[PDB]
DNA sequence: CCGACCGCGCATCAGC
DNA sequence: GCTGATGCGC
DNA sequence: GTCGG
Ligand SMILES: Nc1nc2c(ncn2[C@H]2C[C@H](O)[C@@H](COP(=O)(O)OP(=O)(O)[C@H](F)P(=O)(O)O)O2)c(=O)[nH]1
Ligand SMILES: [Cl-]
Ligand SMILES: [Cl-]
Ligand SMILES: [Cl-]
């Protein structure tokens with residue numbers, strides 16, 4: 001919050017570029033600048049001061065000057081007044097409606113919450129569930145609820161098969177006092193890079209969580225990734241908890257450390273880290289870290305025994321999850 | 327300059 | 343059906 | 353929009 005004013009501005013600009021201009025590199029450019037500035041341990045006093053930070057260029061430096069002088073940005077003022085941009089920005093808040101779908105809906109004169117509701121038949125399944133829980137999915141989850149949710153998921157998974165290991169990642173693993181959703185990494189010894197010795201590994205876990213009425217909706221589901229909806233159980237007479245987004249990612253057990261690094265994030269941290277990997281001549285995904293041949297062809301997976309081995313390869317000092325919140 | 331910008335699972339569609 | 347590109351979300 | 357070379 002030290003430079004919250006500026007970081008909010010850049011985020012609003014990032015969002016505009018993603019949702020409206022559909023210009024994803026501009027989106028990431030703003031996001032990066034915002035991240036670098038939020039980290040910065042001084043209250044910024046000028047665009048020039050900011051332009052010292054990596055990712056802040058001439059254009060963002062000028063905007064910071066405008067913002068510092070007036071408390072606002074004319075460019076954003078006009079964006080907010082623009083009915084089309086506002087409408088598009090709103091619709092993209094519904095899970096499953098991206099920039100493209102949003103702009104189409106608006107072309108059809110579907111541009112409000114009331115419009116979506118009376119046009120349920122125009123929505124695919126994911127979008128349908130995003131509209132249903134539009135309000136709930138806006139709310140954050142107190143760590144205390146995250147802790148109850150973890151207890152359920154782990155215990156239920158243990159009931160299915162004691163050899164399952166479920167690890168809650170995302171901001172929860174980074175120590176955050178609230179999380180926008182729940183991210184669960186799942187492994188089982190029968191699923192490795194070498195073989196899948198047991199089918200329905202993910203399905204069976206999902207099934208059991210539906211059985212106890214923890215999972216209530218499915219956004220999408222495949223052999224290794226589930227994205228859906230869950231809800232804590234509430235006591236007699238007490239108001240129900242909000243429905244929450246959940247994702248479960250089944251990863252080969254022998255690739256746990258690359259998987260847990262991936263699912264811990266943050267997203268910006270992953271981008272920064274894989275970008276650095278590339279500078280050092282490696283490529284990192286949720287499975288492996290591989291060298292890049294002189295051609296730039298990924299080589300064979302390097303041995304990984306801890307998250308720190310991954311950091312080591314790219315010559316980064318290790319960073320605890322709680323210091324990966326970029 | 328100017329090319330590169332992380333990497334990939336699932337849904338959905340076009341074209342064969 | 344299949345492959346491949348695209349959207350969208352992680 | 354920014355940066356590396
Ligand atoms: N390489 C890469 N990894 C990505 C990306 N988006 C999400 N991830 C990874 C890292 C997240 O922590 C993890 C979960 O994705 P997330 O969107 O839930 O983020 P998160 O870190 O959990 C948020 F802080 P919260 O949800 O708690 O409010 O998925 C992406 O674009 N690229
Ligand atoms: Cl772009
Ligand atoms: Cl403003
Ligand atoms: Cl690994």
Ligand SMILES: [Cl-]
Nearest residue numbers: 285287288301
């Ligand atoms: Cl791989």
Ligand SMILES: [Cl-]
Nearest residue numbers: 174320321322
């Ligand atoms: Cl930590």
Ligand SMILES: [Mg+2]
Nearest residue numbers: 170171181183
């Ligand atoms: Mg999360």
Ligand code: NA
Nearest residue numbers: 051052053056
């Ligand atoms: Na800079």
Ligand code: NA
Nearest residue numbers: 092094096097
């Ligand atoms: Na959306």
Ligand code: NA
Nearest residue numbers: 181182183247
């Ligand atoms: Na998630």
